[PDB]
């Protein structure tokens, strides 16, 4: 679940190669216990994140 996949079902059984193109440049979700940082910032309207929740 480290890589968030779009339009690729999680239950696929056909043995082949699945290749997708996505414009956004995501960052690998490798855990870094010694490099955890926190940021404080304001969120404008049309936000989908609950306030005061990391």
């Amino acid at each position: 679940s480290d890589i968030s996949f779009n339009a690729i079902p999680s239950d696929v059984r056909v043995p082949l190669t699945y290749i997708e193109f996505d414009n956004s440049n995501a960052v690998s979700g490798t855990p870094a216990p010694r490099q955890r940082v926190l940021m404080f910032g304001q969120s404008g309207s049309k936000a989908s994140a609950a306030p005061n929740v990391p």
Partner: protein, 55 residues
């Protein structure tokens, strides 16, 4: 089991060793009862990729 693993059929050894159990039968007196569990190796079927072009 070591021979099987070297042949490329089973993967995990420590779990197999910990789940092994060999005992005699208390009724037959000539039959040995063993309960083992192997971890059959997986196959490479699905290769999911995501390409993030920059242009």
């Amino acid at each position: 089991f070591e021979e099987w693993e070297n042949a490329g059929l089973v993967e995990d050894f420590d779990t197999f060793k910990e789940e092994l159990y060999v005992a005699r039968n208390k009724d037959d007196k000539d039959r040995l009862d063993v309960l083992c569990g192997p971890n059959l190796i997986n196959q490479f079927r699905i290769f999911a990729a995501q390409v993030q072009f920059i242009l």
